[PDB]
Amino acid sequence: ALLTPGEVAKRSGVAVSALHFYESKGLITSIRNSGNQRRYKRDVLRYVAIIKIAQRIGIPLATIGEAFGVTLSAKEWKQLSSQWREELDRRIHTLVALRDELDGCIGCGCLSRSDCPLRN
Amino acid sequence: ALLTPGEVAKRSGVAVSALHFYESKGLITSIRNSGNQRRYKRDVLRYVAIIKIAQRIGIPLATIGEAFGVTLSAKEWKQLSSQWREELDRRIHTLVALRDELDGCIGCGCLSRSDCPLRN
Ligand code: FES
Numbered sequence A, B: 001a002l003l004t005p006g007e008v009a010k011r012s013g014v015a016v017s018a019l020h021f022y023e024s025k026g027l028i029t030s031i032r033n034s035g036n037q038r039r040y041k042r043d044v045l046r047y048v049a050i051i052k053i054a055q056r057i058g059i060p061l062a063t064i065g066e067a068f069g070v071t072l073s074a075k076e077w078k079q080l081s082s083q084w085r086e087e088l089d090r091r092i093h094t095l096v097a098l099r100d101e102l103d104g105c106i107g108c109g110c111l112s113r114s115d116c117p118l119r120n
């Protein structure tokens, strides 16, 4: 039912301080009691789980909350999961693009401020 | 011959403070004079140029210096340029790999701590 900060932590593989962070950026929330004695809900593990994946996928921490704006059913996950992949892919290509800029420049070596793609 | 900090800056597109940084991490060097009146050498533009590309390629700032250990002739560039590309590529795939982990998990949505690749 209600998990202690230390519990969510040990079971989500992240420091308590992170749950704080993830709380400051308003990604997860708590329910104080008897002298602000905080606590979290079962599902919370699911979020942090998703949050990590998200970070691992390269999604900026902010854009996380934004997509966290639209019971974390596989239906919902389908969403964040996709928008994020599609995002990952966009990045993937940006590098593949840079990889190519490199490919050309290697044999060159002019590093011309004026014309070298790597330089622009 | 000798470029003022402000000159290397305006012509390399980076703040003077960066040349400082790039000097702290020992990537470029200066030649004080008449009351520590610093100054840089012609070639220095070339380095910073390379440094930026490097950063743009994703190469960690440290590993820059290390590869800066082995007249910046197209011969030399061939080196750093390659080791870096080869590096970029390795990264490129790591994501393509993650992209796939995602691809599978999307339709799922179990986010099982136990078995979900995205989770490990
Ligand atoms: S190094 Fe000459 S085109 Fe880039």
Ligand code: FES
Pocket (backbone or CB within 6 Å): B104, B105, B106, B108, B109, B110, B111, B112, B115, B116, B117, B118
């Ligand atoms: S969400 Fe089920 S395998 Fe990853």
